[PDB]
């Protein structure tokens, strides 16, 4: 139920050897709450939640288990009230976890941050953040304390918070300027070049350079053999492809057909794979004679369209651009719904005009072009008086040519005054919910961004081939960011602080 990487305490070989020849339990309330939440007894689970230690971990695990059990019951065609009960339980436990986190942050910030990232030895060594992410608890990650922790993790071991970005750009462009930067309490270069923000800016500068090189080889003339810039672009795409392969083979599951199906869950990866394959086809067709060379040039142009569009993924790091990108993503669905009606009206008018004006046309593929060309360019400000309804010395007049301007008047009225204004109304009156959901989703996906940048190698893709060959050398032979190992005194202090926090929360709620 819990997930893939999870490994419960019962199935460990220590417990298996204990159970083979047969004690007690160190923490009994963990087992009792797991039992109470597996047998769909809610009030007993809520009673067992407030006893013992590691209360937040218990709340998150209960939420995940309730969600998984609800999904399983819905899949196995149960009474369909069990699903509602289990979802209610999951929401209750999630709300409890969020309230407890809020109380902990409002009491003491530093201990609250330390509480969310210490390794949990009883839950297969996962921090509270990983448990919250595995349960898709958006309200927990989007809290102020979690966002502050993510910011402090993303900034790395640096100390620039008043105005970043420009300082990092100046450091990466002027290496003698790195030393004049304050750090957090030879070895000041390895720490700077491993902060995730520095990796992100290195990757962004590499991508901008790659796009600048790509926009030069298509505008200017091409030759029989590729120039230097074309070789640089090809090398960049090849290294990006082998990096994608490395990312696939370093996944979480152990099955090749399971790692692939979990990597093909974000549409960016699928589109990147399609673009790389299409560019490979274009490059193969490029190193040929004249017609195949022209076709390769065309494939290069379309691939350039895609790589230009892919800059919104880079833009998403901003605090004000990501939500607008997601709003665009949903308004695309709304616009796709309305374009069907607009296309129906457009096809109707186009067919009527083409049939009225030209009554002696042989059947040709050009007929399918006049239906869509003019009626589509007409509603974008290109309305002509001679290209349609021509002034029929004078040319002969087709029968019924006086209907075309009237049909055009009706079509323009119904396509430029009614449908577009209704679409504006739809965008306007369904905007606040989309804005709030987009903010929540972006604040949640900041964690995925931070992790996927901490995992990446130091060098950018143009010169990543050096870091890939060092992977072979280190193969034949998480201090912070993911977990935070602590001693026993710190563990006891954290446990006492958590007990005080939960007791104060219950007292305040009762009051």
Ligand X SMILES: COCC(CCO[C@H]1CC[C@@]2(C)C(=CC[C@H]3[C@@H]4C[C@@H]5O[C@]6(CC[C@@H](C)CO6)[C@@H](C)[C@@H]5[C@@]4(C)CC[C@@H]32)C1)COC
Ligand Y SMILES: CCCCCCCCCCCCCCCCCC(=O)OC[C@H](COP(=O)(O)O)OC(=O)CCCCCCCCCCCCCCCCC
Residues 373-432 that bind ligand Y (CB under 6 A): 407, 410-411, 414
Contact letters (x/-) for Na ion, 364-383, by CB under 5 A? -----------------x--
Q: Of residues 219, 257, 385, 472, which one binds ligand X by CB under 6 A?
A: 219
Contact between 216 and ligand X per CB under 6 A: yes
Residue 429 near residue 422 (C-beta atoms within 8 A): no
Binding of ligand PIO by 144 (CB under 6 A): no
Query: Which of 503, 346, 504 minimizes the C-alpha distance to 416?
Result: 346
Question: Given candidates 82, 172, 273, 325, which one binds ligand Y under the rule CB under 6 A?
Answer: 325
158 within 8 A of 184, measured Cβ to Cβ = yes
Region 379-418 residues binding a copy of itself, contact defined as CB under 8 A: 380-385, 387, 399-400, 403, 405, 407, 409, 412-413, 416-418
Q: Residue 401 interacts with ligand X (CB under 6 A)? A: no
Tokens, residue 284: 């193969």
Give the range of 27-35, 214-222, 375-383, 503-511 binding ligand X by CB under 6 A: 214-222
SS (H, E, C) 476-493: HCCCCCCCCCCCHHHHHH
State how far the Cα of 202 lies from the Cα of 205, in Å rounded to an integer: 5
> In degrees rounded to 5, what are phi and psi of residue 183?
-115, 180
Residue 305 lies near ligand Y (rule: CB under 6 A): yes
- Residue 183 bridge partners (DSSP): 158
**Which x/- pattern, by CB under 5 A, does the window 380-409 give for Na ion?**
-x----------------------------
Q: Where the chain is broken, by preceding residue (C–N > 2.5 Å)?
A: 22, 185, 392, 477
Is there a contact between 62 and 93 (Cβ–Cβ < 8 Å)? yes
Listing DSSP states for 374-410 in one string gives HHHHHTTT---SSSSS----PPPPPTTTTHHHHHHHH
Cα 374 → chain centroid: 39
Q: Which does 329 bind (CB under 5 to 8 A by kind): ligand Y, a copy of itself, Na ion, none?
A: ligand Y
CB of 353 to ligand X, least distance (A): 14
Residue 317 makes contact with ligand PIO by CB under 6 A = yes
Residue ranges of the annotated binding site are: 164, 319-320
Three-state SS string over 7-73 comes to CCCCCCHHHHHHHHCCCCCCCHHHHHHHHHHHCCCHHHHHHHHCCCCCHHHHHHHHHHHHHHHHHHH
Q: Which is nearer to ligand X, 219 or 472 (CB)?
A: 219
**DSSP for residue 176:** G
- Contact call for residue 278 and ligand Y (CB under 6 A): yes
Residue 84 or 151: which CB sits closer to ligand PIO?
Answer: 151
* Residue 216 binding: pick among Na ion, ligand X, ligand Y, none (C-beta 5-8 Å cut-off by kind): ligand X
Taking the C-alpha atoms of residue 55 and residue 39, their distance in angstroms, rounded to an integer, is: 20
What's the length of the chain?
511
What three-state secondary structure class fits 303?
Answer: helix
Query: ∠ at Cα 307 (304, 312), nearest 5°?
Result: 140
> Is 212 a binder of ligand X (CB under 6 A)?
yes
For ligand PIO, which stretch binds (CB under 6 A), given 18-26, 161-169, 180-188, 252-260?
161-169
Instruction: Report, in Å, the least distance between residue 107 CB and ligand Y.
Output: 34
Residues in region 206-265 near a copy of itself by CB under 8 A? 215, 218-222
Interface pattern 330-369 for ligand X (x via CB under 6 A): ---------------------------------xxx-xx-
Q: Please report how close the Cβ of residue 196 comes to Na ion at its closest, in angstroms.
A: 46
Q: Are 56 and 131 in contact (CB under 8 A)?
A: no
Task: Give yes or no for residue 204 binding ligand PIO (CB under 6 A).
Answer: yes
- Collect all residues with Cβ–Cβ distance below 8 Å to 6 and sequence separation of at least 6: 124, 126
Nearest alpha-carbon partner for 189 in 176, 200, 201: 176
The answer to the question of residue 419 lying near ligand PIO (CB under 6 A) is no
Name the residue whose CB lies closest to ligand PIO: 165
Q: Which of 106, 114, 157, 297 binds a copy of itself (CB under 8 A)?
A: 297
Give yes or no for residue 373 binding ligand X (CB under 6 A): no
Decide if residue 19 touches ligand X (CB under 6 A). Answer: no
Region of 41 please: left (phi>0), alpha (psi -120 to 50) or beta: beta
Residue nearer to ligand PIO on the CB measure, 314 or 494: 314
Q: Coil, strand, or helix at residue 453?
A: helix
Q: Given the rule CB under 6 A, which of 1-9, 185-193, 323-331, 483-491 is the region that contacts ligand Y?
A: 323-331
Binding residues (CB under 6 A) for ligand X: these are 212, 215-216, 219, 363-365, 367-368
Binding residues (CB under 6 A) for ligand PIO: these are 163-166, 169, 204, 314-315, 317-319
Binding residues (CB under 6 A) for ligand Y: these are 266-268, 271, 274-275, 278, 302, 305-306, 309, 312, 325, 328-329, 345, 348-349, 407, 410-411, 414
């Amino acid at each position: 139920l819990m997930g893939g990487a999870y490994r419960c305490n019962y199935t460990r070989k220590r417990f298996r050897t204990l159970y083979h020849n047969l004690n007690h339990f160190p923490f009994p309330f963990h087992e009792l709450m797991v039992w109470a939440v597996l047998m769909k007894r809610q009030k007993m689970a809520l009673f067992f939640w407030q006893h013992g230690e590691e209360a937040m971990a218990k709340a998150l695990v209960a939420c995940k288990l309730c969600k998984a059990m609800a999904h399983e019951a819905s899949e196995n065609d149960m009474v369909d009230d069990i699903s509602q009960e289990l979802n209610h339980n999951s929401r209750d436990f999630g709300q409890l976890a969020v309230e407890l986190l809020d109380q902990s942050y409002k009491q003491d910030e530093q201990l609250a941050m330390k509480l969310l990232t210490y390794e949990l030895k009883n839950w297969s060594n996962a921090t509270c953040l990983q448990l919250a992410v595995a349960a898709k608890h958006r309200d927990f990650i989007a809290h102020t304390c979690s966002q502050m922790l993510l910011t402090d993790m993303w900034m790395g071991r640096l100390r620039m918070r008043k105005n970043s970005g420009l300082k990092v750009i100046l450091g990466i462009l002027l290496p003698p300027s790195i030393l004049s930067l304050e750090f957090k309490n030879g070895r000041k270069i390895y720490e700077f070049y491993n902060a995730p923000i520095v990796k992100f800016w290195f990757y962004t500068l590499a991508y901008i350079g790659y796009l600048m090189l790509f926009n030069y080889i298509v505008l200017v003339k091409m030759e029989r053999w590729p120039s230097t810039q074309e070789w640089i672009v090809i090398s960049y795409i090849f290294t990006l492809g082998i990096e994608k392969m490395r990312e696939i083979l370093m996944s979480e599951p152990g099955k090749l057909l399971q790692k692939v199906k979990v990597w093909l869950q974000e549409y960016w990866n699928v589109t990147d794979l399609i673009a790389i394959l299409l560019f490979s086809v274009g490059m193969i067709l490029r190193l040929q004679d004249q017609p195949f060379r022209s076709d390769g040039r065309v494939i290069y142009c379309v691939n350039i369209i895609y790589w230009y569009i892919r800059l919104l993924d880079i833009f998403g790091v901003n605090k004000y651009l990501g939500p607008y990108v997601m709003m665009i993503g949903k308004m695309m669905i709304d616009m796709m719904y309305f374009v069907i009606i607009m296309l129906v009206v457009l096809m109707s008018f186009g067919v009527a005009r083409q049939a009225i004006l030209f009554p002696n046309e042989e059947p040709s593929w050009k007929l399918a072009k006049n239906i869509f060309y003019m009626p589509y360019w007409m509603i974008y400000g290109e309305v002509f008086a001679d290209q349609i309804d021509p002034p029929c010395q004078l040319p002969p007049c087709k029968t019924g040519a006086w209907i075309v301007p009237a049909i055009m008047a009706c079509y323009l009225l119904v396509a430029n005054i009614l449908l577009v204004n209704l679409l504006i109304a739809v965008f306007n009156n369904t905007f606040f919910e989309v804005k709030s959901i987009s903010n929540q989703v972006w604040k949640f996906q900041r964690y995925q961004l931070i992790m996927t940048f901490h995992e990446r190698p130091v060098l950018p893709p143009p010169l990543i081939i050096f870091s890939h060959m060092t992977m072979i050398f280190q193969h034949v032979c998480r201090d912070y960011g993911l977990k935070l190992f602590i001693t026993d005194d710190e563990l006891k202090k954290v446990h006492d602080f958590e007990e005080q926090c939960i007791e104060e929360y219950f007292r305040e709620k009762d009051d």
